[PDB]
Amino acid sequence: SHYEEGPGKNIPFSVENKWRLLAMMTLFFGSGFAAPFFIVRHQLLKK
Amino acid sequence: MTHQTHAYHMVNPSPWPLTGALSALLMTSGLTMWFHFNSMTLLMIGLTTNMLTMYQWWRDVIRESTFQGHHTPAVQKGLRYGMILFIISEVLFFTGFFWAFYHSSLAPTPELGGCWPPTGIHPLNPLEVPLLNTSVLLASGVSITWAHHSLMEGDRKHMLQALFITITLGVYFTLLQASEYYEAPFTISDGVYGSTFFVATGFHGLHVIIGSTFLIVCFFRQLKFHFTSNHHFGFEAGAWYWHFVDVVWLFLYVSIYWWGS
């Protein structure tokens, strides 16, 4: 079994660079929060 | 650690839960196109990936059990609980349907004519074919029982024989019921009477088909010497599900076919 172990190896995303993570994390929760807004926009832009 | 000292099973990664999850999407959104943007392509793809997934998932399950020797005592005791539990959840599913029925028949709206069965509905005769189907399923219950006893007594020929008789009575019920569906003078669209009769008997009908193919699978695993006199859970589970399937029919029979008509 080639499964790495320990802090930062038991997660599906890289935790090596604090800044690349800041980006990944930001897109992740970011997109989550924005989606509802764009859905509402979508509905509003229809007829 | 490394060499495990517990009698439990650590299953190797399988891509089946993902394809199976994906299959649920395909079929559900597939049913949506059909119901609405009138089309069955997606649903066809869904039903396919689904059959493919189930075939391979149980295939592995047999591989791991019959060939690889992974089903220790501790392992099977847990498959019992799982099946037992799974059947209970089915028993609660049919409960919604019986509930709906008793709700509708116990207090008929004036729209029905303030009576049950509603005016215009012509119920089938419980004494005709509904009795035949009752006797058929019951007989399979005794023959499946003869099958399980032959198995635990190492009698290959007879297990295979009682299992065959069982499987055929089960198919005989499917056909018999299919024709009643055709000959029957009411439909899913005839208000509550039809609604209530066709989905309960219908979901049950889908269960006899699901239960029969299960038995058919057991039939083949047996020709292939898969089961030993003492290790044959696939058959124990098959028999449990089959008995569940009679009992639901015994309840539909007394409620919907007799009392409710």
Partner: protein
């Protein structure tokens, strides 16, 4: 009715094979003769356009969307009236 067929309706494959061909199947045979010794045919019910029947709030996604899945022309009338 009741039931009291003397002895053996328990444990032993021979006993179960016995009930299978000695009780189970003869039953299905009786019931089968019975269900066919009355297998005539009902006269298609007189048509009356009741509103709580032949319900259609949305067209069936198959055929002309007005014919039920196991539509049987003889005994099942459309909302308008019998098939023919």
């Amino acid at each position: 009715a009741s039931a009291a067929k003397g002895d053996h309706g328990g444990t032993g494959a021979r006993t179960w094979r016995f009930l299978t061909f000695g009780l189970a199947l003869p039953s299905v045979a009786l019931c089968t003769l019975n269900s066919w010794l009355h297998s005539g045919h009902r006269e298609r019910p007189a048509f009356i356009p009741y509103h709580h029947l032949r319900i259609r709030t949305k067209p069936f996604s198959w055929g002309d969307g007005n014919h039920t899945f196991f539509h049987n022309p003889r005994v099942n009338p459309l909302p308008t009236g019998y098939e023919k």
